[PDB]
């Protein structure tokens, strides 16, 4: 029963909710088990990074963000072809590869190719056998480091470019942002109807000819 201006509330407790109550007393044990598994997996691959394969540079959809850069699932086949790495070979050296990712922009392609080249530059390819075959690094850069790479490999940072103070001219001052936005919205709304009217006028002229 309501009483002198309370909120109208609709709790979702009409089912047998007490049957399916999920407690969280397992949380510290779960965290400890996850940490132990992570440490064991890191120890299993002694020189390889604990984080895993390198991830590409990805920009987010959904204009809400539209500007953040995060790690992708894997490098596209076009990026591998430009960088010169076989798709089947790449997964064996620690490079994430997925075949679903398209490539629309040149900037992202070039950034990912540069990232792949930078990763290849700082890569220590151990020989398959104690004897050193082709493409294996020298023994000098093998005893120098054999430890894990803590954290993500080449961490992704959303970097912005600082703009120097300008010398603003009269052309920028005369620009009307609000009017331009309103005109652009009106043009976008009326493009199709104006095209229809122009077509109708053209048909009127053609029927006047005959």
């Amino acid at each position: 029963a309501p009483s002198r201006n309370g909120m109208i509330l609709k709790p979702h407790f009409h089912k047998d909710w007490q049957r399916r109550v999920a407690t969280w007393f397992n949380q510290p044990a779960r965290k400890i088990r996850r940490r132990k598994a992570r440490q064991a997996r890191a120890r299993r691959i002694a020189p390889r990074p604990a984080s895993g394969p390198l991830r590409p540079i990805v920009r987010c959809p959904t204009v809400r963000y539209h500007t953040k850069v995060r790690a992708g699932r894997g490098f596209s086949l076009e990026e591998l072809r430009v960088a010169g790495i076989h798709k089947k070979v790449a997964r064996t050296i620690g490079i994430s590869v997925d075949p679903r990712r398209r490539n629309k922009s040149t900037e992202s392609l070039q950034a990912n190719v540069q990232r792949l080249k930078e990763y290849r530059s700082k890569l220590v390819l151990f020989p398959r056998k104690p004897s050193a075959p082709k493409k294996g690094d020298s023994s000098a850069e093998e005893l120098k480091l054999a430890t894990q790479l803590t954290g993500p490999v080449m961490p992704i940072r959303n970097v912005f470019k600082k703009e120097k103070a300008r010398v603003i001219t009269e052309e920028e001052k005369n620009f009307k942002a609000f009017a331009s936005l309103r005109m652009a919205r009106a043009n976008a709304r009326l493009f199709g109807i104006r095209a229809k009217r122009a077509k109708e006028a053209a048909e009127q002229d053609v029927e006047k000819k005959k």
């Binding site: 204009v63 809400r64 703009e163 103070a165």
Partner: protein
């Protein structure tokens, strides 16, 4: 703490603070929001006007990302940049007019609320309002549209 609660002071009292004429029954008026139209209508109509009825158009698949457009007023615009940038203004005898990017700070729309200090600025934003643009032009700045 049940020690500090009212139930400790009600020991020895027959009705336990719920009256002896009208007892504490299960649900004298009904469960939940029952009776919004009958026998509870006065409360709903004098505390929640517009509860009953339907108004407006439906939007089946609504996505909040499309309608995402944070707004910032001109009252607090120099706060997005470091204080030394504002200190390096009305100075250097050149009219530097430092550029302020609101999309970097997480804003798309610039509104005209507040008073803008007399210093030229370069403001880059997804959208601008008429009053904000008027204030910026009057101060001596320029509005730049960024996609």
């Amino acid at each position: 703490p049940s020690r500090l609660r009212k139930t400790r002071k009600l020991r020895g009292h027959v009705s336990h603070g719920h009256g002896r004429i009208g007892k504490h029954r299960k649900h004298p008026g009904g469960r939940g929001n029952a009776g919004g139209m009958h026998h509870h209508r006065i409360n709903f109509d004098k505390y929640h006007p517009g509860y009953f009825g339907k108004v407006g158009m439906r939007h089946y698949h609504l996505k909040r990302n499309q309608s995402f457009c944070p707004t910032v007023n001109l009252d607090k615009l120099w706060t997005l940049v470091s204080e030394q940038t504002r200190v390096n203004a009305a100075k250097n005898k050149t009219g530097a007019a430092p550029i302020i990017d609101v999309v970097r700070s997480g804003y798309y729309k610039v509104l005209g609320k507040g008073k803008l200090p007399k210093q030229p600025v370069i403001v880059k934003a997804k959208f601008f309002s008429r009053r904000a643009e008027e204030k910026i032009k009057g101060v001596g700045g320029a509005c730049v549209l960024v996609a």
